[PDB]
Enzyme design. Structure first.
Site, PDB file in Angstrom:
ATOM      1  N   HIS A 162       0.815  -1.206   0.000  1.00 16.80           N
ATOM      2  CA  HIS A 162       0.000   0.000   0.000  1.00 16.80           C
ATOM      3  C   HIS A 162       0.850   1.257   0.000  1.00 16.80           C
ATOM      4  O   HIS A 162       0.448   2.274  -0.580  1.00 16.80           O
ATOM      5  CB  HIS A 162      -0.960  -0.018   1.207  1.00 16.80           C
ATOM      6  CG  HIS A 162      -1.550   1.325   1.543  1.00 16.80           C
ATOM      7  ND1 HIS A 162      -2.638   1.856   0.882  1.00 16.80           N
ATOM      8  CD2 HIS A 162      -1.181   2.254   2.455  1.00 16.80           C
ATOM      9  CE1 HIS A 162      -2.920   3.049   1.376  1.00 16.80           C
ATOM     10  NE2 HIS A 162      -2.052   3.312   2.333  1.00 16.80           N
ATOM     11  N   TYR A 197      -0.132   9.628 -11.169  1.00 19.75           N
ATOM     12  CA  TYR A 197       0.808   8.555 -10.899  1.00 19.75           C
ATOM     13  C   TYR A 197       0.444   7.302 -11.677  1.00 19.75           C
ATOM     14  O   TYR A 197      -0.729   6.921 -11.741  1.00 19.75           O
ATOM     15  CB  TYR A 197       0.835   8.233  -9.412  1.00 19.75           C
ATOM     16  CG  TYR A 197       1.822   7.139  -9.050  1.00 19.75           C
ATOM     17  CD1 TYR A 197       1.468   5.792  -9.104  1.00 19.75           C
ATOM     18  CD2 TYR A 197       3.110   7.459  -8.644  1.00 19.75           C
ATOM     19  CE1 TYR A 197       2.388   4.799  -8.760  1.00 19.75           C
ATOM     20  CE2 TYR A 197       4.024   6.481  -8.299  1.00 19.75           C
ATOM     21  CZ  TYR A 197       3.662   5.161  -8.359  1.00 19.75           C
ATOM     22  OH  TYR A 197       4.590   4.219  -8.006  1.00 19.75           O
TER      23      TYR A 197
HETATM   24 ZN   LIG Z   1      -2.507   4.751   3.764  1.00 21.62          ZN
END
Ligand SMILES: [Zn+2]
Ligand SMILES: [Zn+2]
Length: 273
Positions: A162, A197
Protein backbone atom coordinates in the site's frame (compact mmCIF):
# COMPACT_ATOMS: atom_id res chain seq x y z
CA UNK A 1 -23.74 -4.47 26.33
CA UNK A 2 -23.01 -1.88 23.64
CA UNK A 3 -21.07 -3.53 20.77
CA UNK A 4 -18.49 -2.02 18.45
CA UNK A 5 -20.65 -2.99 15.46
CA UNK A 6 -23.83 -1.12 16.35
CA UNK A 7 -21.91 1.60 18.18
CA UNK A 8 -20.19 2.46 14.85
CA UNK A 9 -22.95 1.69 12.32
CA UNK A 10 -22.47 3.71 9.13
CA UNK A 11 -19.15 5.23 10.27
CA UNK A 12 -16.79 3.16 8.10
CA UNK A 13 -15.82 6.18 6.01
CA UNK A 14 -14.24 9.49 6.88
CA UNK A 15 -16.96 10.42 9.41
CA UNK A 16 -15.64 7.67 11.67
CA UNK A 17 -11.87 8.20 11.59
CA UNK A 18 -11.79 10.67 14.49
CA UNK A 19 -15.12 9.44 15.87
CA UNK A 20 -14.97 7.76 19.28
CA UNK A 21 -15.72 4.05 19.57
CA UNK A 22 -16.02 1.98 22.74
CA UNK A 23 -12.91 -0.11 23.41
CA UNK A 24 -13.28 -3.82 22.83
CA UNK A 25 -11.59 -7.12 23.54
CA UNK A 26 -10.08 -8.85 20.53
CA UNK A 27 -8.48 -11.95 22.03
CA UNK A 28 -6.33 -12.80 25.02
CA UNK A 29 -3.99 -9.88 25.73
CA UNK A 30 -5.11 -7.95 22.62
CA UNK A 31 -7.58 -5.06 22.60
CA UNK A 32 -9.22 -2.74 20.10
CA UNK A 33 -8.74 0.81 21.38
CA UNK A 34 -9.07 2.77 18.16
CA UNK A 35 -11.91 4.84 16.73
CA UNK A 36 -14.92 3.84 14.63
CA UNK A 37 -12.91 4.37 11.44
CA UNK A 38 -9.24 3.74 12.30
CA UNK A 39 -7.89 0.86 14.36
CA UNK A 40 -5.46 1.13 17.24
CA UNK A 41 -4.24 -2.11 18.85
CA UNK A 42 -3.20 -2.57 22.47
CA UNK A 43 -1.27 -5.67 23.50
CA UNK A 44 -0.92 -6.15 27.23
CA UNK A 45 1.49 -7.84 29.62
CA UNK A 46 2.45 -7.39 33.23
CA UNK A 47 5.85 -6.33 31.82
CA UNK A 48 4.23 -3.43 29.97
CA UNK A 49 2.16 -3.09 26.83
CA UNK A 50 2.61 -2.50 23.11
CA UNK A 51 0.39 -0.19 21.07
CA UNK A 52 0.08 -0.14 17.26
CA UNK A 53 -1.14 3.00 15.46
CA UNK A 54 -2.44 6.27 16.84
CA UNK A 55 -5.31 7.03 14.50
CA UNK A 56 -5.55 10.46 12.87
CA UNK A 57 -3.59 13.47 14.04
CA UNK A 58 -6.30 14.62 16.48
CA UNK A 59 -7.16 11.20 17.89
CA UNK A 60 -4.56 10.80 20.67
CA UNK A 61 -6.98 11.51 23.57
CA UNK A 62 -9.59 9.13 22.14
CA UNK A 63 -7.28 6.11 22.36
CA UNK A 64 -5.66 7.33 25.56
CA UNK A 65 -9.16 7.16 27.01
CA UNK A 66 -9.91 3.76 25.49
CA UNK A 67 -6.82 2.47 27.30
CA UNK A 68 -7.91 3.70 30.73
CA UNK A 69 -11.54 2.76 30.13
CA UNK A 70 -10.14 -0.80 29.90
CA UNK A 71 -8.29 -0.52 33.22
CA UNK A 72 -4.79 -0.06 31.78
CA UNK A 73 -2.30 2.70 32.50
CA UNK A 74 -1.00 4.46 29.36
CA UNK A 75 2.27 4.92 31.27
CA UNK A 76 2.64 1.12 31.01
CA UNK A 77 2.80 0.94 27.21
CA UNK A 78 6.50 0.65 26.40
CA UNK A 79 6.47 0.53 22.58
CA UNK A 80 4.43 2.27 19.90
CA UNK A 81 4.41 0.57 16.49
CA UNK A 82 2.79 1.47 13.18
CA UNK A 83 1.09 -0.27 10.29
CA UNK A 84 2.04 2.32 7.66
CA UNK A 85 3.19 5.90 7.46
CA UNK A 86 0.05 7.90 6.64
CA UNK A 87 -1.48 10.58 8.87
CA UNK A 88 -4.78 8.74 9.39
CA UNK A 89 -2.93 5.85 11.05
CA UNK A 90 0.15 7.48 12.59
CA UNK A 91 -0.98 11.11 12.66
CA UNK A 92 -0.64 11.40 16.44
CA UNK A 93 2.22 8.99 17.07
CA UNK A 94 4.09 12.01 18.42
CA UNK A 95 1.48 13.27 20.90
CA UNK A 96 0.71 9.64 21.76
CA UNK A 97 4.38 9.05 22.57
CA UNK A 98 5.00 11.96 24.95
CA UNK A 99 1.67 11.28 26.63
CA UNK A 100 3.04 7.76 27.27
CA UNK A 101 6.84 7.76 27.30
CA UNK A 102 6.91 4.78 24.94
CA UNK A 103 9.72 4.21 22.50
CA UNK A 104 8.99 3.90 18.78
CA UNK A 105 10.14 1.02 16.57
CA UNK A 106 9.62 0.78 12.82
CA UNK A 107 10.81 -0.90 9.63
CA UNK A 108 13.60 0.83 7.78
CA UNK A 109 11.33 1.42 4.77
CA UNK A 110 9.22 3.70 7.01
CA UNK A 111 11.88 5.50 9.07
CA UNK A 112 12.41 8.47 6.73
CA UNK A 113 8.71 9.44 6.60
CA UNK A 114 8.20 8.84 10.34
CA UNK A 115 11.17 11.04 11.26
CA UNK A 116 10.11 13.78 8.80
CA UNK A 117 6.30 13.59 8.75
CA UNK A 118 6.34 13.97 4.92
CA UNK A 119 5.25 10.98 2.81
CA UNK A 120 7.96 9.33 0.77
CA UNK A 121 9.04 10.31 -2.72
CA UNK A 122 8.22 6.68 -3.66
CA UNK A 123 4.66 6.80 -2.29
CA UNK A 124 2.12 6.72 -5.16
CA UNK A 125 -0.04 9.11 -3.11
CA UNK A 126 2.37 11.98 -2.60
CA UNK A 127 1.86 14.71 -2.92
CA UNK A 128 -1.86 14.13 -2.62
CA UNK A 129 -1.71 12.90 0.98
CA UNK A 130 -0.86 15.34 3.79
CA UNK A 131 1.76 15.06 6.52
CA UNK A 132 1.80 14.70 10.29
CA UNK A 133 4.07 15.69 13.17
CA UNK A 134 7.42 13.89 13.09
CA UNK A 135 8.89 11.51 15.64
CA UNK A 136 12.28 9.92 16.35
CA UNK A 137 12.52 6.19 15.64
CA UNK A 138 14.41 4.65 18.56
CA UNK A 139 14.71 1.12 17.15
CA UNK A 140 14.75 0.73 13.39
CA UNK A 141 13.75 -2.74 12.27
CA UNK A 142 14.33 -5.15 9.41
CA UNK A 143 11.91 -7.63 7.86
CA UNK A 144 11.36 -10.49 10.29
CA UNK A 145 12.48 -8.61 13.40
CA UNK A 146 10.72 -8.95 16.75
CA UNK A 147 9.64 -6.25 19.17
CA UNK A 148 9.98 -7.91 22.58
CA UNK A 149 8.50 -6.66 25.86
CA UNK A 150 8.91 -9.30 28.53
CA UNK A 151 7.21 -12.43 27.25
CA UNK A 152 5.52 -10.35 24.54
CA UNK A 153 6.90 -10.97 21.06
CA UNK A 154 5.41 -9.00 18.16
CA UNK A 155 7.14 -9.99 14.94
CA UNK A 156 7.10 -7.62 11.93
CA UNK A 157 7.10 -8.16 8.17
CA UNK A 158 7.83 -5.52 5.56
CA UNK A 159 4.67 -5.68 3.40
CA UNK A 160 5.00 -2.77 0.96
CA UNK A 161 1.78 -3.20 -1.04
CA UNK A 162 0.00 0.00 0.00
CA UNK A 163 2.96 2.30 0.70
CA UNK A 164 6.75 1.98 0.79
CA UNK A 165 6.81 1.82 4.60
CA UNK A 166 3.93 -0.62 5.02
CA UNK A 167 4.41 -3.17 7.80
CA UNK A 168 2.33 -6.08 9.06
CA UNK A 169 2.51 -7.53 12.56
CA UNK A 170 2.01 -11.00 14.00
CA UNK A 171 1.85 -12.44 17.54
CA UNK A 172 0.24 -15.17 19.64
CA UNK A 173 -2.78 -14.68 21.91
CA UNK A 174 -4.40 -17.16 24.27
CA UNK A 175 -7.83 -17.03 25.89
CA UNK A 176 -8.67 -17.96 29.47
CA UNK A 177 -8.66 -21.70 28.64
CA UNK A 178 -5.21 -21.67 26.94
CA UNK A 179 -6.58 -21.89 23.43
CA UNK A 180 -4.01 -19.91 21.45
CA UNK A 181 -4.40 -18.13 18.14
CA UNK A 182 -2.09 -16.11 15.96
CA UNK A 183 -3.26 -12.57 15.42
CA UNK A 184 -2.21 -10.81 12.22
CA UNK A 185 -2.48 -7.01 12.10
CA UNK A 186 -2.17 -6.96 8.31
CA UNK A 187 -1.72 -3.44 6.94
CA UNK A 188 -3.96 -1.79 4.38
CA UNK A 189 -3.20 -3.43 1.03
CA UNK A 190 -4.84 -1.02 -1.42
CA UNK A 191 -2.77 0.10 -4.42
CA UNK A 192 -3.96 3.69 -4.87
CA UNK A 193 -2.28 6.83 -6.12
CA UNK A 194 -2.58 10.44 -7.05
CA UNK A 195 -4.16 10.82 -10.49
CA UNK A 196 -0.98 11.55 -12.45
CA UNK A 197 0.81 8.56 -10.90
CA UNK A 198 1.28 5.38 -12.96
CA UNK A 199 2.46 2.12 -11.39
CA UNK A 200 3.62 0.94 -14.82
CA UNK A 201 6.36 3.62 -14.70
CA UNK A 202 7.69 2.45 -11.30
CA UNK A 203 9.11 -1.09 -11.42
CA UNK A 204 10.61 -0.69 -7.95
CA UNK A 205 7.14 0.07 -6.54
CA UNK A 206 5.56 -2.78 -8.52
CA UNK A 207 8.16 -5.26 -7.29
CA UNK A 208 7.73 -4.10 -3.70
CA UNK A 209 3.95 -4.53 -4.09
CA UNK A 210 4.36 -8.13 -5.24
CA UNK A 211 6.63 -8.79 -2.26
CA UNK A 212 4.12 -7.27 0.14
CA UNK A 213 1.14 -9.20 -1.23
CA UNK A 214 3.15 -12.39 -0.98
CA UNK A 215 4.17 -11.78 2.63
CA UNK A 216 0.67 -10.68 3.68
CA UNK A 217 -0.84 -13.85 2.24
CA UNK A 218 1.56 -16.05 4.22
CA UNK A 219 1.35 -14.37 7.64
CA UNK A 220 0.41 -16.72 10.49
CA UNK A 221 -3.17 -15.59 10.66
CA UNK A 222 -5.86 -17.18 12.82
CA UNK A 223 -7.43 -13.77 13.50
CA UNK A 224 -7.14 -11.05 10.87
CA UNK A 225 -7.16 -7.41 11.99
CA UNK A 226 -6.77 -4.40 9.67
CA UNK A 227 -5.92 -0.73 10.25
CA UNK A 228 -9.30 0.04 8.72
CA UNK A 229 -11.67 -2.29 10.61
CA UNK A 230 -14.05 -2.80 7.68
CA UNK A 231 -11.24 -4.05 5.45
CA UNK A 232 -11.43 -7.26 7.56
CA UNK A 233 -15.09 -7.13 8.71
CA UNK A 234 -13.70 -6.56 12.16
CA UNK A 235 -16.63 -5.08 14.10
CA UNK A 236 -19.10 -7.82 13.15
CA UNK A 237 -16.52 -10.49 14.01
CA UNK A 238 -15.86 -8.78 17.36
CA UNK A 239 -19.63 -8.47 17.90
CA UNK A 240 -20.45 -12.15 17.42
CA UNK A 241 -22.02 -11.37 14.05
CA UNK A 242 -19.19 -13.09 12.15
CA UNK A 243 -16.44 -15.64 12.88
CA UNK A 244 -13.50 -14.07 14.69
CA UNK A 245 -11.21 -17.02 13.82
CA UNK A 246 -10.58 -17.81 10.15
CA UNK A 247 -7.03 -19.01 9.39
CA UNK A 248 -7.65 -18.37 5.68
CA UNK A 249 -8.37 -14.64 6.09
CA UNK A 250 -4.94 -13.20 5.25
CA UNK A 251 -4.65 -15.29 2.11
CA UNK A 252 -8.06 -14.20 0.85
CA UNK A 253 -7.37 -10.60 1.85
CA UNK A 254 -4.06 -10.56 -0.08
CA UNK A 255 -5.57 -12.39 -3.05
CA UNK A 256 -8.25 -9.70 -3.16
CA UNK A 257 -5.79 -6.81 -2.91
CA UNK A 258 -3.74 -8.45 -5.65
CA UNK A 259 -6.84 -8.76 -7.79
CA UNK A 260 -7.49 -5.04 -7.33
CA UNK A 261 -3.87 -4.28 -8.28
CA UNK A 262 -4.07 -6.27 -11.51
CA UNK A 263 -7.20 -4.40 -12.57
CA UNK A 264 -5.23 -1.20 -11.99
CA UNK A 265 -2.28 -2.34 -14.14
CA UNK A 266 -4.75 -3.38 -16.86
CA UNK A 267 -6.36 0.06 -16.77
CA UNK A 268 -2.93 1.64 -17.24
CA UNK A 269 -2.19 -0.70 -20.15
CA UNK A 270 -5.39 0.19 -22.03
CA UNK A 271 -4.34 3.84 -21.71
CA UNK A 272 -1.57 2.94 -24.20
CA UNK A 273 -3.54 3.90 -27.31
ZN1 LIG B 1 -2.51 4.75 3.76
ZN1 LIG C 1 -5.83 4.22 5.97
Amino acid sequence: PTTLATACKGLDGREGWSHPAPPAHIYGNTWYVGTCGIASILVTSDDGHVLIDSGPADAAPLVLANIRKLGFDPADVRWILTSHEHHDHAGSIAELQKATGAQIAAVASARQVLESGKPSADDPQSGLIEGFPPVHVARVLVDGDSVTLGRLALTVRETPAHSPGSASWTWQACDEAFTCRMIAYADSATTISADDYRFSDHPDRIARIRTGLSRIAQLPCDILVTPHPSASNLFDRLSGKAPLVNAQACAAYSQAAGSYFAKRLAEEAGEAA
